[PDB]
Structures are given as structure tokens and as C-alpha cells.
CSV table of C-alpha atoms and ligand atoms in Angstrom, one decimal:
chain,number,residue,atom,x,y,z
A,1,UNK,CA,0.0,0.0,0.0
A,2,UNK,CA,3.0,2.3,-0.7
A,3,UNK,CA,2.8,5.7,-2.3
A,4,UNK,CA,6.6,6.1,-2.5
A,5,UNK,CA,7.5,3.5,-5.1
A,6,UNK,CA,4.1,3.3,-6.8
A,7,UNK,CA,4.4,2.8,-10.6
A,8,UNK,CA,2.0,5.0,-12.7
A,9,UNK,CA,1.1,5.5,-16.3
A,10,UNK,CA,-0.8,8.4,-17.9
A,11,UNK,CA,-1.4,10.4,-21.0
A,12,UNK,CA,-0.1,14.0,-21.4
A,13,UNK,CA,-1.5,16.7,-23.7
A,14,UNK,CA,-0.5,20.4,-24.0
A,15,UNK,CA,-3.0,22.7,-25.7
A,16,UNK,CA,-4.2,21.1,-29.0
A,17,UNK,CA,-1.1,18.9,-29.2
A,18,UNK,CA,-1.1,15.1,-29.5
A,19,UNK,CA,-1.5,12.9,-26.4
A,20,UNK,CA,1.8,11.2,-25.4
A,21,UNK,CA,2.0,8.2,-23.1
A,22,UNK,CA,4.2,8.0,-20.0
A,23,UNK,CA,5.3,5.5,-17.3
A,24,UNK,CA,7.1,6.4,-14.1
A,25,UNK,CA,7.8,5.8,-10.5
A,26,UNK,CA,6.4,8.0,-7.7
A,27,UNK,CA,9.3,9.2,-5.4
A,28,UNK,CA,7.7,11.6,-3.0
A,29,UNK,CA,4.6,13.4,-2.0
A,30,UNK,CA,5.9,16.8,-1.0
A,31,UNK,CA,5.1,17.6,2.7
A,32,UNK,CA,4.6,21.3,2.2
A,33,UNK,CA,2.3,20.7,-0.8
A,34,UNK,CA,0.8,17.2,-0.7
A,35,UNK,CA,-0.7,17.7,-4.1
A,36,UNK,CA,2.7,17.7,-5.6
A,37,UNK,CA,4.3,14.4,-6.5
A,38,UNK,CA,7.9,14.0,-7.6
A,39,UNK,CA,8.2,11.4,-10.3
A,40,UNK,CA,11.0,9.6,-12.2
A,41,UNK,CA,9.8,8.7,-15.7
A,42,UNK,CA,11.3,5.6,-17.3
A,43,UNK,CA,14.2,6.6,-19.6
A,44,UNK,CA,14.4,10.2,-18.5
A,45,UNK,CA,17.0,11.3,-16.0
A,46,UNK,CA,15.4,14.5,-14.4
A,47,UNK,CA,13.0,14.4,-11.5
A,48,UNK,CA,9.7,15.9,-12.3
A,49,UNK,CA,7.0,17.5,-10.2
A,50,UNK,CA,3.3,17.3,-11.0
A,51,UNK,CA,0.2,18.2,-9.1
A,52,UNK,CA,-1.6,15.1,-10.4
A,53,UNK,CA,-4.9,16.1,-8.8
A,54,UNK,CA,-5.2,19.5,-10.5
A,55,UNK,CA,-3.1,19.3,-13.7
A,56,UNK,CA,-5.5,19.1,-16.6
A,57,UNK,CA,-2.7,18.0,-18.9
A,58,UNK,CA,-2.7,14.6,-17.2
A,59,UNK,CA,-5.2,12.0,-18.4
A,60,UNK,CA,-6.0,8.4,-17.9
A,61,UNK,CA,-3.9,8.1,-14.7
A,62,UNK,CA,-3.4,4.5,-13.8
A,63,UNK,CA,-1.5,2.6,-11.1
A,64,UNK,CA,0.6,-0.1,-12.6
A,65,UNK,CA,1.0,-3.6,-11.1
A,66,UNK,CA,3.2,-3.4,-8.1
A,67,UNK,CA,6.9,-4.3,-8.3
A,68,UNK,CA,7.8,-7.4,-6.3
A,69,UNK,CA,10.5,-6.4,-3.7
A,70,UNK,CA,27.4,1.2,0.4
A,71,UNK,CA,28.5,4.8,-0.6
A,72,UNK,CA,26.7,7.2,1.6
A,73,UNK,CA,30.2,8.6,1.5
A,74,UNK,CA,29.4,10.2,-1.9
A,75,UNK,CA,26.6,12.4,-0.5
A,76,UNK,CA,27.7,16.0,-0.5
A,77,UNK,CA,30.7,15.5,-2.8
A,78,UNK,CA,31.7,17.5,-5.8
A,79,UNK,CA,32.0,15.1,-8.7
A,80,UNK,CA,32.9,15.0,-12.4
A,81,UNK,CA,30.3,12.8,-14.2
A,82,UNK,CA,31.3,11.4,-17.6
A,83,UNK,CA,28.9,10.4,-20.3
A,84,UNK,CA,28.7,9.5,-24.0
A,85,UNK,CA,27.2,11.8,-26.6
A,86,UNK,CA,25.3,10.9,-29.8
A,87,UNK,CA,28.4,10.7,-31.9
A,88,UNK,CA,30.2,8.5,-29.4
A,89,UNK,CA,32.5,11.1,-28.0
A,90,UNK,CA,33.0,11.5,-24.3
A,91,UNK,CA,31.9,14.6,-22.3
A,92,UNK,CA,31.7,15.4,-18.6
A,93,UNK,CA,29.7,17.6,-16.3
A,94,UNK,CA,30.7,18.8,-12.9
A,95,UNK,CA,28.1,18.7,-10.2
A,96,UNK,CA,27.3,17.8,-6.6
A,97,UNK,CA,25.8,14.6,-5.1
A,98,UNK,CA,22.8,15.8,-3.1
A,99,UNK,CA,21.3,12.7,-1.3
A,100,UNK,CA,20.1,9.2,-1.8
A,101,UNK,CA,16.8,9.1,-3.7
A,102,UNK,CA,13.8,8.0,-1.6
A,103,UNK,CA,12.2,5.1,-3.3
A,104,UNK,CA,14.6,3.8,-5.9
A,105,UNK,CA,17.2,2.9,-3.3
A,106,UNK,CA,20.3,2.4,-5.5
A,107,UNK,CA,19.7,5.9,-7.0
A,108,UNK,CA,21.1,9.2,-6.0
A,109,UNK,CA,19.9,12.8,-6.4
A,110,UNK,CA,22.5,15.0,-8.2
A,111,UNK,CA,22.6,18.4,-9.9
A,112,UNK,CA,25.1,20.1,-12.2
A,113,UNK,CA,26.4,23.6,-12.8
A,114,UNK,CA,25.5,23.3,-16.5
A,115,UNK,CA,21.9,22.3,-15.7
A,116,UNK,CA,20.9,23.1,-12.1
A,117,UNK,CA,17.8,21.0,-11.9
A,118,UNK,CA,17.3,17.7,-10.1
A,119,UNK,CA,18.6,14.6,-11.7
A,120,UNK,CA,18.7,11.0,-10.5
A,121,UNK,CA,21.3,8.3,-11.5
A,122,UNK,CA,22.7,5.0,-10.2
A,123,UNK,CA,25.9,6.7,-9.3
A,124,UNK,CA,27.6,3.7,-7.6
A,125,UNK,CA,27.3,1.8,-10.9
A,126,UNK,CA,28.7,4.8,-12.8
A,127,UNK,CA,31.6,4.9,-10.2
A,128,UNK,CA,32.5,1.3,-10.7
A,129,UNK,CA,32.5,1.8,-14.4
A,130,UNK,CA,35.0,4.7,-14.2
A,131,UNK,CA,32.5,7.4,-15.1
A,132,UNK,CA,32.4,9.3,-11.8
A,133,UNK,CA,35.3,11.1,-10.3
A,134,UNK,CA,34.9,12.2,-6.7
A,135,UNK,CA,36.7,15.4,-5.7
A,136,UNK,CA,38.2,16.5,-2.3
A,137,UNK,CA,15.0,26.5,7.1
A,138,UNK,CA,13.1,28.2,4.2
A,139,UNK,CA,11.1,25.1,3.3
A,140,UNK,CA,7.5,26.0,2.6
A,141,UNK,CA,8.2,29.6,1.8
A,142,UNK,CA,7.0,31.3,-1.4
A,143,UNK,CA,9.8,32.4,-3.8
A,144,UNK,CA,9.9,34.8,-6.6
A,145,UNK,CA,12.5,36.2,-9.0
A,146,UNK,CA,12.4,38.9,-11.7
A,147,UNK,CA,12.4,37.6,-15.3
A,148,UNK,CA,7.9,37.7,-12.1
A,149,UNK,CA,8.5,33.9,-11.8
A,150,UNK,CA,6.8,32.5,-8.7
A,151,UNK,CA,7.2,29.2,-6.8
A,152,UNK,CA,7.7,27.4,-3.5
A,153,UNK,CA,10.7,26.0,-1.6
A,154,UNK,CA,10.0,22.3,-1.3
A,155,UNK,CA,13.1,20.7,0.3
A,156,UNK,CA,16.4,21.6,2.1
A,157,UNK,CA,19.4,19.4,1.3
A,158,UNK,CA,20.5,18.0,4.7
A,159,UNK,CA,24.2,17.6,3.5
A,160,UNK,CA,24.4,21.3,2.4
A,161,UNK,CA,21.8,23.3,4.2
A,162,UNK,CA,22.2,26.5,2.0
A,163,UNK,CA,21.0,24.3,-0.9
A,164,UNK,CA,17.3,24.0,-1.6
A,165,UNK,CA,14.9,22.5,-4.1
A,166,UNK,CA,12.3,25.0,-5.6
A,167,UNK,CA,9.2,24.1,-7.6
A,168,UNK,CA,8.2,27.0,-9.9
A,169,UNK,CA,4.5,27.3,-10.8
A,170,UNK,CA,5.2,27.5,-14.5
A,171,UNK,CA,7.4,24.4,-15.0
A,172,UNK,CA,7.6,20.7,-14.0
A,173,UNK,CA,11.4,20.5,-13.3
A,174,UNK,CA,12.8,20.8,-9.8
A,175,UNK,CA,15.3,23.6,-9.6
A,176,UNK,CA,18.3,23.4,-7.2
A,177,UNK,CA,19.9,26.5,-5.8
A,178,UNK,CA,22.7,27.3,-3.4
A,179,UNK,CA,21.5,30.5,-1.9
A,180,UNK,CA,25.0,32.0,-1.4
A,181,UNK,CA,25.8,31.9,-5.1
A,182,UNK,CA,25.3,34.2,-8.0
A,183,UNK,CA,22.7,31.9,-9.6
A,184,UNK,CA,20.4,32.5,-6.6
A,185,UNK,CA,21.0,36.3,-6.3
A,186,UNK,CA,17.6,37.3,-7.7
A,187,UNK,CA,15.5,34.9,-5.5
A,188,UNK,CA,13.4,36.5,-2.8
A,189,UNK,CA,11.2,34.8,-0.3
A,190,UNK,CA,8.0,35.3,1.7
B,201,2OD,C1,6.2,16.8,-21.8
B,201,2OD,O1,7.3,16.0,-21.3
B,201,2OD,C2,8.4,16.0,-22.1
B,201,2OD,C3,8.6,16.7,-23.4
B,201,2OD,C4,9.8,16.5,-24.0
B,201,2OD,C5,10.8,15.7,-23.5
B,201,2OD,C6,10.6,15.0,-22.3
B,201,2OD,C7,9.4,15.2,-21.6
B,201,2OD,O2,9.1,14.5,-20.4
B,201,2OD,C8,10.1,13.8,-19.8
B,201,2OD,C9,9.3,13.2,-18.6
B,201,2OD,C10,8.4,14.2,-17.9
B,201,2OD,N1,7.3,14.6,-18.5
B,201,2OD,C11,6.5,13.6,-18.7
B,201,2OD,C12,5.0,14.2,-18.6
B,201,2OD,C13,5.2,15.5,-17.9
B,201,2OD,C14,6.6,15.6,-17.6
B,201,2OD,N2,12.0,15.7,-24.3
B,201,2OD,C15,11.7,16.6,-25.4
B,201,2OD,N3,12.6,16.8,-26.4
B,201,2OD,C16,10.4,17.1,-25.3
B,201,2OD,C17,10.6,18.6,-25.2
B,201,2OD,C18,9.3,18.8,-25.9
B,201,2OD,C19,9.4,17.4,-26.5
B,202,2OD,C1,22.6,11.4,-20.7
B,202,2OD,O1,23.5,11.6,-19.6
B,202,2OD,C2,23.8,10.6,-18.9
B,202,2OD,C3,23.3,9.2,-19.1
B,202,2OD,C4,23.7,8.3,-18.2
B,202,2OD,C5,24.7,8.6,-17.1
B,202,2OD,C6,25.2,9.9,-17.0
B,202,2OD,C7,24.8,10.8,-17.9
B,202,2OD,O2,25.1,12.2,-17.9
B,202,2OD,C8,25.6,12.7,-16.6
B,202,2OD,C9,25.4,14.2,-16.7
B,202,2OD,C10,24.0,14.7,-17.2
B,202,2OD,N1,23.7,14.4,-18.4
B,202,2OD,C11,22.5,14.9,-18.6
B,202,2OD,C12,22.4,15.3,-20.1
B,202,2OD,C13,23.8,15.2,-20.6
B,202,2OD,C14,24.6,15.2,-19.5
B,202,2OD,N2,25.0,7.4,-16.3
B,202,2OD,C15,24.2,6.3,-16.9
B,202,2OD,N3,24.2,5.1,-16.4
B,202,2OD,C16,23.4,6.8,-18.0
B,202,2OD,C17,23.8,5.9,-19.1
B,202,2OD,C18,22.3,5.7,-19.5
B,202,2OD,C19,21.9,6.4,-18.2
B,203,NA,NA1,1.9,34.9,-0.2
């Protein structure tokens, strides 16, 4: 009877566009906004937030049949994360391991300077394969910044408490900010 770890499928439609079909795993029901679910969609690496009870773009929501059931040292670390591009050449992004992901146990939350939204990867596998180099509260408040983009602070990172997750009203990504840095300098809170 778990929410965390439920598998779901649904349709998605924007405006008069076509309906696309999606499958994913529910990770979290956000405590400061229980309408908001964080979801990992199969094949896509970002964590997404949807208010499933209110978002008219969601249709035909179904619960899928239920699945049949260390390196905490990496949490908080600066990392260089290597990956393959479409032409087969190697590239790398620098980022920060944020936490273990809640439901998909072997998975970690991570974000990157080049794309400071919330991602999820099986970083211990990536580490064993040589693709991860390891280097050396406002929750519940409203946020705005000037483009007025509005949102809510939904989580504080235990390992780096100046780092927060923000859900903006106009988008389904989860944004990550370290409030001492330039990238956060236009965020204001209420
Ligand atoms: C609408 O979602 C996506 C749209 C796109 C996508 C991935 C999407 O979703 C990933 C998984 C979360 N969504 C699934 C339902 C809501 C969030 N990669 C793309 N190139 C596009 C950009 C426009 C076509
Ligand atoms: C597509 O990127 C990655 C894919 C993968 C990855 C690391 C990747 O990238 C890290 C940094 C962010 N990327 C996000 C867009 C490009 C960079 N570790 C893996 N096991 C996989 C292989 C299939 C899942
Ligand atoms: Na207010």
C-alpha cells in the first residue's frame, strides 16, 4: 500500500497537441504541498514535479501492477560525471551529489552547474565503471525572482543546508539553488 514506489502511467496533452503516453515511479509526496508528486519517468534522467490532482494535462492516470520487492560517502561530494554523446565522443559535467533518492534505493539525487535541476542516477554503478570522479529553514516559503516567476521552496538538502529545491508554478522541473551563489542572487522569499 505504498505511495513512494508506486508505478504509474498516464497520458499527457499540451494545448491542442497530441497525447503522449508516459510510465514512471512516484518518489515523494511533498510535505509542504501534498498535491505535488515527484516522479521519475522511465528513460528520462530528471526528477519531475506534477500536481496530479489538478493538472489538466494529465489524463488516464493508472496505477501499474506493483513491483515485487554502500556509498553514503558520496553524499555532498563534488563530482565529475562522464557520459557518452550521440556521436560516441565523451563529455563530462561537474556537479554535486545531493542525497540518496527516496524510493529507488540504489539511486542518487545529483545536480550540475551546466543544468541546475534535479537529476537521478545509479551513481555507484557509474563509479564502478569509471565514469564518476569524486573530488576532495526556508522550506514552505514562497519564492519569486524577476524575469515575475513564482514558486515554493519544497526541500532543504541535509548535507548542504544552504541548498534548496524549488518548484516554480510554470514548470515541471525541480530547480536546485545554493542561496549563497550568484545563480540565486535574484531569488526573494516570503
Ligand atoms: C512533456 O514532457 C516532455 C517533453 C519533451 C521531453 C521529455 C518530456 O518529459 C520527460 C518526462 C516528464 N514529462 C512527462 C510528462 C510530464 C513531464 N523531451 C523533449 N525533447 C520534449 C521537449 C518537448 C518534447
Ligand atoms: C545522458 O546523460 C547521462 C546518461 C547516463 C549517465 C550519466 C549521464 O550524464 C551525466 C550528466 C548529465 N547528463 C544529462 C544530459 C547530458 C549530461 N549514467 C548512466 N548510467 C546513464 C547511461 C544511461 C543512463
Ligand atoms: Na503569499
